[PDB]
Amino acid sequence: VYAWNRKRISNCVADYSVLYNSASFSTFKCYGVSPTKLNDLCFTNVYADSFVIRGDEVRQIAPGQTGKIADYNYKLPDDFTGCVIAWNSNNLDSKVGGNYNYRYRLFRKSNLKPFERDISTEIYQAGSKPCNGVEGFNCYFPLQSYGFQPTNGVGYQPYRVVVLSFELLHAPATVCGPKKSTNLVKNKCVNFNFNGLT
Amino acid sequence: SALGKLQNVVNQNAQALNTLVKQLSSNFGAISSVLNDILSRLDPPEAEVQ
Amino acid sequence: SALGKLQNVVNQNAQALNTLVKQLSSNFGAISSVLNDILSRLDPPEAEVQ
């Protein structure tokens, strides 16, 4: 989550109906757009932000949330449009001895901007005493690992979260829905849909 | 500027119409100022609010 | 009460200005009538609503 992966999606036709109709996702929650209207609109600036978090932290992947990974790992803007996708991954991203490959930023001086990534492995000064880049008393590494075990209860089990981020109509669009194009008629009153513009 | 009294009335009426037309471009706190965009993007429970 | 006609105009203008000032002390359903108190007591998602 501190180094969440951002992938650009462009120049493709996207069928979001296979995402709504799939029951694999525990949370399929969209904010600035209806989930069922995604096949009827055209988009550009589509971004997929992929990371792994806890079970109780899936509420913090939302606009306007106060939280820990919201402030120091992954921040969403107040005017965010898109969909947050979360599904349980205890069968894949957990080990009986402890899966420690997923890390979060426990310590930071200030909250992040929306869509800001911090991968800097610099030390934090948690006390009055300066640390000088060396661990010690009140000097801790900012990145700490999750202790994922399959025997743990819900709320702490690993969840895979993908955030789809869009922009609405304010640019030429390259990602569209599976709606078929009709022929054009001249000099008649029609209700048209040009790339999501109705 | 001889006929300024009539031109003031004409300008005031045209300016009032222009302001009234310009006010459609404001979203007033909604996600968009275009009704078609809201009706094509959202379900009726939240489109009702917008 | 000889000059009541001018005094009414002066009183109405002063009273309208005083009422416009006193409307700032009303919260209009918000938690406080002061913007600084709202900005200091709440996060921007709810401070925006207030």
CA distances from B3 to A45, A182, B7, B9, C32 (A): 55, 55, 6, 11, 52
* CB-based contact, B40 to chain A, within 8 Å: yes
Task: Sort out which chain B residues have CB atoms less than 8 A from A168's CB and list them.
Answer: 32, 37, 41
**CA dist., res. A65 & res. A76, Å (int):** 8
Q: List, in order, residues 6 or more apart from C19 with CB less than 8 Å away.
A: none
Cα A115 to Cα C25: distance, rounded to the nearest angstrom: 39
**CB A14 within 8 Å of CB A175:** yes
Rounded to 5°, the CA angle A188-A190-A191 comes to: 170
Measuring CA to CA, how many Å separate A182 from each of A152, A185, A192, A193, B23? 54, 9, 10, 10, 34
Element at C6 (helix H, strand E): helix C4-22
Distance CA A122, CA A134 (A): 10
What is the distance between the alpha carbons of residues A78 and A65, in angstroms, rounded to a whole number? Answer: 9
Structure tokens given for A87 = 């599904």
**Furthest-apart CA pair in chain B: how many Å?**
58
Buried b (16+ CB within 10 A) or exposed e, A176-195: bbeeeeeeeeeeeeeeebee
Q: How far is B33 from chain A (nearest CA, A)?
A: 12
Q: How many CB pairs under 8 A join A and B?
A: 28
DSSP code of residue B37 = H
Indicate which of B31, B32, B41, B42 best probes the interface with A, i.e. most A CBs within 10 Å of its own CB: B41
Question: How far, in Å, CA of A19 to CA of A11, rounded?
Answer: 19
**Dist CA A34 CA A81 (whole Å):** 10
Contacts of C43 in chain A (CB under 8 A): 64, 66
Give the neighbours of chain B: at least 3 Cβ pairs within 8 Å. Answer: A
B42 in contact with A, Cβ within 8 Å = yes
How was this one solved? cryo-EM
Q: What is residue B30's three-state secondary structure? A: coil
B-chain CB neighbours of A34 within 8 Å are 41-43, 46
Contact A162, A146 (CB under 8 A): no
- Resolution expressed in Å: 2.2
Give the C-alpha separation, A5 to A162, whole Å: 9
- Alpha carbon C22 to its chain's center: 4
Q: A184-187 contacts: CB < 8 A, separation 24 or more? A: none
CB A145 within 8 A of CB A102: yes
Distances (CA, A) of A75 to A4, A80, C40: 11, 10, 21
Residue A175's beta-bridge partner residues?
A: A12, A43
Q: Could you tell me which chain B residue has the CA closest to the CA of A80?
A: B31
Residues with Cβ within 8 Å of residue C30, at least 6 apart in sequence = C38, C50
Environment class of A24 (CB within 10 Å of its CB; exposed 0-12, middle 13-18, buried 19+): exposed
- Determine the Cα–Cα distance for residues A169 and A184; give it in Å rounded to an integer: 21
Q: Which residues pair with A165 in a beta bridge?
A: A47, A82
- C chain contacts of residue A63, beta-carbon cutoff 8 Å: 45
Tokens coding A107 = 């310590």
Listed in sequence order, the residues at least 6 apart from A131 whose beta carbon sits closer than 8 Å to its beta carbon are: A123, A124, A125, A138, A139
CA–CA distances in Å: residue C50 to residues A34, A76, A78:
26, 21, 15
Q: What is the 3-state secondary structure (H, E, C) of A88-150?
A: ECCCCCCCCCCECCCEEECCCCCCCCCCCCCCCCCCEECCCCCCCCCCECCEECCEEECCECC
Ramachandran sector of residue A169 (left: φ over 0; alpha: ψ -120 to 50; beta: rest): left
Amino acid letter at B7? Answer: Q
Largest Cα span, chain C: 58
Cα distances (Å, whole numbers) of residue A103 to A49, A52, A54, A79 = 16, 9, 11, 28
Residue with tokens 């006929």: B3
